[PDB]
Each structure stands twice: as C-alpha cells, then as structure tokens.
Amino acid sequence: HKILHRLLQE
Amino acid sequence: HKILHRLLQ
Amino acid sequence: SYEMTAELDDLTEKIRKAHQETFPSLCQLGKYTTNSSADHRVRLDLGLWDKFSELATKCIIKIVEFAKRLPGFTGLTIADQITLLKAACLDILILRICTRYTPEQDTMTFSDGLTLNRTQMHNAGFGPLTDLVFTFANQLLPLEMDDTETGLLSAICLICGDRQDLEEPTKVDKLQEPLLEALKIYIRKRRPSKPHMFPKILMKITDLRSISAKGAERVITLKMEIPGSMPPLIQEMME
Amino acid sequence: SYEMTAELDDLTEKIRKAHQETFPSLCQLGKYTTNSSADHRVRLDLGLWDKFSELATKCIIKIVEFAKRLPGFTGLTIADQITLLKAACLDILILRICTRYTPEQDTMTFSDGLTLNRTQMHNAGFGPLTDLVFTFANQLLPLEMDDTETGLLSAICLICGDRQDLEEPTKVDKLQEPLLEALKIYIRKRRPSKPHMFPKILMKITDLRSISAKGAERVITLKMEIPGSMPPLIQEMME
Ligand SMILES: CC1(C)CC=C(c2ccccc2)c2cc(/C=C/c3ccc(C(=O)O)cc3Cl)ccc21
Ligand SMILES: CC1(C)CC=C(c2ccccc2)c2cc(/C=C/c3ccc(C(=O)O)cc3Cl)ccc21
C-alpha cells in the first residue's frame, strides 16, 4: 500500500 | 472452580 | 520561570490543541441518527459497515495528522513513524469513540455527528466485542477526562518505546517521558482533591491494550465476513 | 533526604517476602538443561510440553499462595478472589518467567531450575508468541527491578477493581491504592536520580496486558495440539 506514506509526506 | 475454591479456603 | 515547567506547559498546550483540532468534542457535534437495523443484532449490516469503515478511515487520517503535530514524532525514522502509527491505531480509535459515549441513550457519536445505539455499533462491526467496548466507555465517565488528558493519553499510546520492530526504541522511549510528566502535572493541577488519579487515568491504557489485542482479532474475523475488501488505509494499518 | 514512611515500609516488606517465598530468584536456583529439540523449531514438543504444563500448574499454585499473603485479599469474597486471580493469572505467569531471563544465553529458567533457550521455549508452548515474550523479557532488563518491585507489580496487577463481575469493586480499589503508593516510594528511595521510573515500571502492566490478551488465545490453540486435556487448574484459571 502507498496511502500511509502519502499521508505522512503530505 | 473446585480447585481454586479449595486452595483459597 | 523554572525551565521544565515552561517546556511542559507548552508541550501540554500543543497536545491539547492537536487533539481538539483533529477530534471534535461531543458537545460540538450536530447529532443525527439512522434506522438501519436498530432493533436487533445481526451478523453484519453492510450498509452500517460501509459508513462505519468510511468514518474509521477519516479518523485514521486525523490520527496521522495528530501524530505529525506531536513534538519529536516527525524526528523519528520513517519506518518507526509507520510502526508506531500501526501499533497504536486501534488503541486511539477505541479511546476516541469511547469519549463520544452518551449514557442516557447508550449511544456513540462519530465525527460527522452520526449517532448509533449499542445494537447498531454491534451490527456495524463491533460484533462480539460490543459490550466490552461499551463497558470501557462507562468506566471512563467517573474520570471526567478533557481534551488535554485524552490528547496526552493518545500521545502516550502512540509514542511507545516497547512496540515491536522499532529501529530506535530508546529515542522513542525518551520521547514518551515528557508526556508522562506532563500528564502527571496536569492531573495534579486539575484534581487537587483526588490523590492517585495519575496512576488511575494512566492505567486506562491497560484497558485499551487488552481491547486492542482482541480488536485486532475481530478485524481479522471481519475480513472474512464482509463481501469485499476493507478500505485500503485500513488494510494497510492492520497489516 | 527522605520522609518517614513506616507503614508503607512495612507493607512493602510483606509483599517482597510473599513474592520471594513463592518465587525463587535466578541466583537461588540450580539450573539444568535438556537436549530435547534444542536445534530447530517444531509445532509442539510433547516432552517439553509435559514438563511445561506441570511447571505451569505448580506456579499457578504458588501465585494463589502469593495472593493469599497480600494484606486484605482473604478479606474479599471468595467469588472476588477467584475473579481477580482468573483475570491476572496469565499476566503474572508472563511477568514471572520473564524475570528469569538470562540475556547472554537467551534462556528462561523455571522454578525447578530447568533452563531452555528460545527455540525450546517455542517448542514447549510459546509457539508464535515466542519472540513477543522474549522481547518483553529484554525490555525489563534496563529497569533493574528487584524482588520488591516485581512483587509490588504483581500485587497491583492482581488487585484491580476494574475486573468485570467483581462484587465489592471499591473494596478492591482500597487495597490497591496503598500498593501503588508503596511502589512509588520504594522506587524513589532505591533510585534517587530517576523520578521517571515510577510510571515507566507501572506501565509494564500495560505491556503485560497486551501479551496476556494474545496469550489467552494461545492457550486455546494449545488445547487442539496437546494429547488429552489441559491440566484442571489451568482450565479453571483460563476458563
Ligand atoms: C476493534 C473494534 C471493536 C472493531 C473493529 C474496529 C475497526 C473496524 C475496522 C477498521 C478499524 C477498526 C473498531 C473501531 C473502533 C473505532 C472506530 C472509530 C473511532 C472514531 C471515529 C470518529 O471520530 O468519527 C470513527 C470510528 Cl469508525 C473501535 C473499536 C473497534
Ligand atoms: C503468552 C503465553 C505463551 C500464553 C500461554 C502460556 C501458557 C500455556 C499453557 C498453560 C499455561 C500458560 C504462557 C505461560 C507463561 C509462563 C509460564 C510459567 C511461568 C513460571 C514458571 C516457573 O516459575 O516455573 C513456569 C511456567 Cl510454565 C508465559 C507465557 C505464556
């Protein structure tokens, strides 16, 4: 999955 | 709880 | 202007504000209800599940935002931030929803105002753990916890050096120390009458842990009861 | 440098003695090893399990004895005593075995001296929870807890007024409060340069709860793997 990292980075 | 009861009493 | 007092006061304020701005208070929410399977328990109300899991996803997003606002959190390794978030996700979800409990109607209210009764929470996904969670919500009542305390308890849950597979457990553990002191001091200033409230409030985390452990298994059971996948963010967390 | 704490100094003495006299320390035991499946991990070593289950039964007996020696415990209804024991038994078993961990050899020692490495503990019954338990054992090391602190921590775990189905919950609360105060003060005297230790140690109970919640599931799984029935006393505690 890629959502959590995107949420973190954003 | 036969065992526990005996051990406690 | 004792230094640590000044630092802890401002740590306390950051956390109170982070919690408030990522989790609306029960009194501030415009409550609304629904008739979906409200009279009897069923294995799963799919309609309720969809809405429930959508709101869970949105709350998880808020928990991430909350985390990023905690002093030092974004100073941890990327892997550790992920690890901590995943490990505390259910802890904080449980604590949050349980601070939205209304005894009179025996209901819980979500961040959009949705208010479900015990039977609906069961049918939405709580299932066999429903009564366990409601009991916990009741035990929180006599404590009178506010935003500051709930925020600090949440931060303490998240910033936990004993979580498995941390890269820098010591750094995390040290980061938690100020949170513990801040909670102690705040409880003291707010409850002069009550003596041992620090241990009492702090150890509600023991409850969360127990419920969370059982909850992880419940989520696994849900994975096979739902005719479809859970939201991707939920999938990722529960991994 | 330190205030007078006669009574608590006395209670702390009774608890330390109760612990020591129902749980021998690592140095007091004549260790011995076995070669049974010391090489690779298996589903379950029947030989190791046979010994494990016997040792578990004997330690549970010891924990009951320990409980009866906590001031006030025998003053509770038999129903409450049983409720408290059943709720905390596994927590105390975990704490006990983890306090017998030898980091250099990565082993744990039972009350008869039997000493098994990580793989053997796995084959003996720990199963998929092996690394979790060993991780907790390692996490205790830096705390440098002694018999008094381990005893007090055990007592606080057992004497908990939040347990479901208690008949006189407030009576239990009243007993626990002095135990909390005793631990705080004892830690204060032993460690003078580390005020942070009280919450640190107290919160190992939260770790314990997470492990025992999962551990309860492991005991269910064992029922399917072992020949015959679970020893009757273990059944009563986990029933
Ligand atoms: C472990 C258990 C009993 C059952 C399954 C839960 C669950 C189910 C799917 C995903 C994540 C958690 C759950 C959610 C929660 C909390 C969800 C939640 C909290 C706050 C909000 C909000 O503020 O809107 C929304 C939700 Cl859904 C509590 C307990 C559970
Ligand atoms: C988390 C887990 C794997 C769950 C189940 C365990 C277990 C398994 C079978 C029966 C009773 C308990 C268990 C026992 C223990 C500890 C048992 C124990 C403690 C002390 C002694 C002694 O001092 O001789 C002996 C044992 Cl068996 C620790 C962890 C578990």
Author numbering:
A (entry chain G): 630 to 639
B (entry chain F): 630 to 638
C (entry chain A), D (entry chain B): 170 to 408
Anything the authors wrote about it?
RARs are members of the nuclear receptor (NR) superfamily and act as ligand-inducible transcription factors binding to DNA regulatory elements in the promoter regions of target genes by forming heterodimers with another NR, the retinoid X receptor (RXR). Our understanding of how ligand binding leads to receptor regulation has been greatly advanced by structural studies of RAR LBDs in complex with different pharmacological classes of retinoids as well as CoA- and CoR-derived fragments. These structures revealed that RAR LBDs exhibit a common fold comprising 12 α-helices (H1-H12) and a short β-turn (s1-s2) arranged in three layers to form an antiparallel “α-helical sandwich”. Another key component of the LBD is the C-terminal helix (H12) which is repositioned upon agonist binding to complete a hydrophobic surface with residues from helices H3 and H4 that is specifically recognized by the LxxLL motifs (also called NR boxes) of CoAs. To gain structural insights into the specific binding and activity profiles of the newly characterized synthetic ligands, we solved the crystal structures of RARβ LBD in complex with BMS411, BMS641 and BMS948.
Furthermore, the partial activity of BMS641 toward RARβ was confirmed as the dose-response curve plateaued at about 50% of the TTNPB-induced activity. Indeed, BMS641 lies in a portion of the LBP that is not occupied by the ligand in the RARα-Am580 and RARγ-BMS961 complexes. This shift in the position of BMS641 relies on the presence of the bulky C8”-phenyl ring which pushes the ligand toward RARβ Ile263. The superposition of all three structures reveals that, although all BMS compounds are able to lock RARβ in the active conformation which is consistent with their agonistic activity, the phenyl extension of BMS641 protrudes slightly more from the LBP toward helix H12 than that of BMS948 and BMS411. A likely consequence is that the RARβ-coactivator interaction may be less optimal in the presence of BMS641.
